[PDB]
Design a protein around this nucleic acid. Sequence first.
DNA 1: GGGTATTCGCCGTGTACCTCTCCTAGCCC
RNA 2: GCGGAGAGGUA
DNA 3: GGGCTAATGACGGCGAATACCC
Lengths: 69, 49, 1340, 99
Amino acid sequence: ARVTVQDAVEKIGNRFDLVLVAARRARQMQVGGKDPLVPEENDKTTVIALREIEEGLINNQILDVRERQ
Amino acid sequence: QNMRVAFMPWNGYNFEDSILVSERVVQEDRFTTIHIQELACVSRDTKLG
Amino acid sequence: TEEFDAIKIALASPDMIRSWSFGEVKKPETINYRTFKPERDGLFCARIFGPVKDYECLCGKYKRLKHRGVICEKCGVEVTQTKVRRERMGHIELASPTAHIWFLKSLPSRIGLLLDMPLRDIERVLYFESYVVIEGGMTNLERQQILTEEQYLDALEEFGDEFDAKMGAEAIQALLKSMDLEQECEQLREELNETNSETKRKKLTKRIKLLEAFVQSGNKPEWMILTVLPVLPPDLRPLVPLDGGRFATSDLNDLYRRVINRNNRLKRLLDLAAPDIIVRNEKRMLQEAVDALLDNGRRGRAITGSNKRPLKSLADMIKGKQGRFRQNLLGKRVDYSGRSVITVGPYLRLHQCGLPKKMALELFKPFIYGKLELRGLATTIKAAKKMVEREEAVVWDILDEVIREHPVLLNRAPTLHRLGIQAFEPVLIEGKAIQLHPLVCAAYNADFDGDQMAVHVPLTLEAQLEARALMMSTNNILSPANGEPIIVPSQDVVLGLYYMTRDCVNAKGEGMVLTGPKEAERLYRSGLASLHARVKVRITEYEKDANGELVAKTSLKDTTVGRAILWMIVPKGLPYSIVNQALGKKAISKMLNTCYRILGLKPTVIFADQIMYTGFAYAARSGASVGIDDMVIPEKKHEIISEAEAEVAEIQEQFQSGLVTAGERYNKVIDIWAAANDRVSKAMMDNLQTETVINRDGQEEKQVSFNSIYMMADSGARGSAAQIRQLAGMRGLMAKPDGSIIETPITANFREGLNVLQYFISTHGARKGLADTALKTANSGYLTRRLVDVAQDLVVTEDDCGTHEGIMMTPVIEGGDVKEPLRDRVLGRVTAEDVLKPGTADILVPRNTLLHEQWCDLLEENSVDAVKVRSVVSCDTDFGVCAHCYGRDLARGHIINKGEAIGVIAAQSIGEPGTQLTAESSIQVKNKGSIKLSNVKSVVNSSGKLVITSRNTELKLIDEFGRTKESYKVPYGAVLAKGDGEQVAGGETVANWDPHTMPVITEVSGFVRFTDMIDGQTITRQTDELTGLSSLVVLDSAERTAGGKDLRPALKIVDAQGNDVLIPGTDMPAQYFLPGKAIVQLEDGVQISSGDTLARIPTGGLPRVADLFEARRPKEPAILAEISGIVSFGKETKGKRRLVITPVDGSDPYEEMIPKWRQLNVFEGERVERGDVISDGPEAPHDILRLRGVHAVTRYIVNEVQDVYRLQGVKINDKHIEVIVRQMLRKATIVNAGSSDFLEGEQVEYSRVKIANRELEANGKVGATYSRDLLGITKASLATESFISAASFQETTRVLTEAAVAGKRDELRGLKENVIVGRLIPAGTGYAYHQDRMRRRAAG
Amino acid sequence: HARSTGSYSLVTQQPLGGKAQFGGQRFGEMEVWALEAYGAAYTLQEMLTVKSDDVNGRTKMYKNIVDGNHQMEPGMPESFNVLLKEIRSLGINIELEDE
DNA sequence: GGGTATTCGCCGTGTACCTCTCCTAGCCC
RNA sequence: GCGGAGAGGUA
DNA sequence: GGGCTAATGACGGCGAATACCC
Ligand SMILES: Nc1ccn([C@@H]2O[C@H](COP(=O)(O)CP(=O)(O)OP(=O)(O)O)[C@@H](O)[C@H]2O)c(=O)n1
Ligand SMILES: [Mg+2]
Ligand SMILES: [Zn+2]
Ligand SMILES: [Zn+2]
């Protein structure tokens, strides 16, 4: 289990819209419109989206550019 | 019932006021209580029968 | 579901009520009790409210869904879904127009003052004893004349016409319909323009505001009287049939039936034209029934059938705890939730919790079904259900797989603060008890003695992310109240670590050299070395001294085996020193603190877990126990007790002879017993503390003992010195019921045995303690509820408002020393402006910077004493606060994030800890320093004293490097010794004054001259012989004799020649009005020395905190000065002496009456400052705010509360008290004019934005000056903008009535409203959402 | 004691309180305050509507969970509608406005 | 009559949970 | 058989 | 059973309504 989200909050310092972007990503992941960019280790889609956020691949702007594309 | 107790901390399984107990206690069947529930079914007389 | 906003409330007009209603309920019957079909007409009626069963009529002609609008011809019931029976309302046509109880009996009787008629008269009318003549035409009778029975009779017989009187609520409605709102409103404004008197102007302004509200809102007054009465949908007031032909019904059914009965009987009587008396009785009865329906309890309390308890009416359903808002709209009952007993589970990670299999399956049932169907193990949902009810291995495998990353919420019954709810990852376990991680117990206040916890499951994806991110145990390590860690090891862990680190003079393996901790463990676990034994070890510590790089320094330290064993866990960045000490509770806590400050969150979490595991393990290996011999009776106890008994015997015998009063003997005995108690305690601590006289190789030595109870004391695991005393010493003094202390103490201790008396006494003590805790908890709960309620809507909305205002914060140095230092007081606050070194143009902190640890240490290196920091109270932002004005402090370390609801965190942090809340002769400098006097103007006299002539004089202490250590307040008339510059030795007496005596000090010399001090009229010369004794009595105003009532004796201070010497610089003729009880002992004829005695003049805890936060006038408030300047007397002895403050510049006409009993601290010819004390006593916050202003009142409240809180040793950051205070003073009162109504109480936010709009406009237009007001949280919450917030917890009837009459419109704007309506709170994760919605209106 | 879904109450369509009947835990006002102290808006929202009080919301959420998707549709709590009806039963007109 | 006291009456008084009995009543046909 | 009283108990 | 009818043991705070004192 991912015991700390400290690096994800260091990516976006509000610590609140972090939850929103991670929820949007994990909702695009659960209802299978999209695919994970990280090799999953039997995590559920919430911890997958946090693991993706902490690695710098996804934020709000990447979501907006990919959605309009 | 009166049992052999030892006052010591045992890897924090008795951390707070919690109590540690030996399998011998359940084996010797010394803390098993019998309880008894009562249930009632009542057949009344309705006007439909 | 529609997307809505703005809930509007107003009076219901009878046509609107008819609009809502679907039918009339004519008969009160509901159902046939024999066949359970509803009545054809009745409180439950299918043709009015709806079909009982979905899509089928009553008689059964039409039952199919094909028909959706048809209304059966036989039974007039339409075929639709039974759910509609939940929303359709009915109505009753009343024969006699009836009054709405809410608009009548609510404390401000709005019918009463709207009609400008006192409540007493309306009551006289409503109970039908007398008439009132409403517009009696051209006769000799006024419009509000009360008439008795036979006066009405003779009047009617004499005056057949031009006589209009009527009775009852219909009469009142007649009065309401005929009122001209606008004409009376304008007349009232003219009257206000003509009238200048306080109380009438207040009643007039209230009434004018009411009239304006009606003419703006569009409500017509006549609607307060009911003609049609709506009836609640049936399913909301059910009549459920109990098994056994009997029925169970809500009380509303009874009330409605009674109302219908009285209505129908009145109808028949009207059709029969019965005499007036009988119809009046029937109308009265209908009144009782209806008003019992609306609000039962404002009358003779119409009780229920055969139960003696008053039945619950609609108002009762809404108002109150048990009823509604509290119960069902803020206190719901979620699904996917469980409860069970909590258990230890040491093996857990900090971020997880043991969860029983069966509850987990039950909770996650739908998840199980979904996953089972995805994997294809079940064809359909019912097969999934059957598979869960058999519970096969596949189900447990799916549960393990689904549970993997899904977090659950754990809650403990009294959720005092936000750490009462935390998220954990569950681990499936056997058993029926929930397993809780030990470290978090402190946060939950959880104990494993039958405490239970509830477990909720977050369902949606956003909820899961929120639980794991915001609420998870590991994310909450710092308390939101103060920055310190919450998860500190509690008792077993700290005991184990303590055992591990303490050293012993001699053991196995003394002084052998180890290459590292790993071979230390090799030695200890193999039994080749003691767990504690002094040893030299080579250790490599890491230090991040560079820009985040770790540098290994490796050297030989002298430590114990145990300290090495502990060092294995410690992460890289920490200095070895941390573990090198005894490692008690404090040491471990500060260890965690440093680990957090240096490394960050994740290492701190893992380090805490490691600490727990090692502590538990080695506590178990220690084998610490408690035997009867572990508590050592001090050897010299018996001697001490026998000696104290002999001493008490000598003092009692020496009392029986009568050289000492009873009280004095009491004091002596109590003090000698206290001394004996301290003696025995110290003897016991010496015996127990360092008693291990164990031998090294040769000679002996002595060391801090290894007595298990002593280790339990010193480590801070359990027990305090007091309880050790209570075990092995004499258990001190006790308090009897009334608080008086018993003369003989309890000499025995629990190791020994008490006897009946000593036990009995301690029983009283414990009983009182328990009762205290109970009542204390109730009061706490109430206080915290008010706090969270008042401050809920406050949110951090803006990043920086950009104001320059701020409060100059200093360290509160109460008397002897620095109770609370600067660094903690300023940490995490942004600065209001750059502070300069002691040398100008040496900027130490740029414009607003967050003051983190590094800045605080930098300030320590310099000698900054006071720092102006931006405070939330002075923040400029409209409708919330800005990040900068608040600061950083949180469970996390960084600056506050936009959107966070700081009001609730502040209120919770102030409330939760509130459950443990219950001579001055010489000054003595504590540390050697320079003396400095502040706010004083002295004049050296002939005796050589620095005479104090200021009442606000302070004597602070500057140290070597310019810092104020000690501070005292020196009053008028205290003899001084050292002046300015002198260095004072430790504990040296610098000042002197009489405790029970305030002397009046003369400024100049010369002869005492008697003026208006005539002998015989007001004074009686009773004088003694040569030695100069007298009893000349200058009595005060109250005690002056009957003849000397108006003649005021005076003493003018003249010199040796006769001329009155004038105060330096002033022309004032010194005319000294001798104050109360002036005993002129020193008669005329003795050269006065400088310092002659003229006149001898002989709560805390939870209630104090609640009173400070409610701003309660303490029934004897001190009085202050408004402007400065020469004060003067006036028209004498009217019953309250007049004081007129004359400003040297400003206008004179400010008079203040003063009661006779009041003693004055200032002389007439004195120089007062605004808001200086005139009378002694506790000051009510309102005056301080009004005179001195915002920063003064806020500092006063914050300091006064923080004093109570620190007295108990509970640390709270001031920001929370500040946030509450800011919520308190939300309102202002307008003094000028220009855009408002010139007197309306209006929130400071709207007033400020009106000024901002004028500034935004290029034209200056009108700007109106406003004065701040401070209101206590109860009233302050009552005067909130949103009416749902106020209605949520207070008198529902009052606020509901106010908002109904005012036509108020709620934009919800807050947290509690949004909660109630079930949409996203504007705080935190939802802030963006609401901000988004803000953009959604008035956009494309 | 634990429950996923079961019988709900008559007047305010919240789940029964108790152990004899399945019954849910009481998420009281103090717990609401706890959630508000965090920025936890969605958790509180579902706890307030989808978990207890919103009828259509609760059934839609059951179906959605069964479908293996985790979203929600908060709606307005039924108890609030009961509140409107009870206040409206007095002589007080309280309407949900729209613009 | 106008300001000040005094009586007077209403409103509030912690959360979560767990057992049990008892639930419209009286009189007349 | 949803409710509410009364009694007791838990933390 | 079914049918018909309908007293005394809190306490504090606050604000409005008289009681009364000049
Ligand atoms: N009337 C009551 C009595 C108790 N409680 C609850 O029981 C606990 C008292 O702990 P406590 O501090 O009083 C005893 P404990 O925590 O075990 O430490 P100690 O034994 O070493 O002194 C708190 O959680 C209270 O909320 C309550 O809500 N109402
Ligand atoms: Mg406990
Ligand atoms: Zn039909
Ligand atoms: Zn600001």
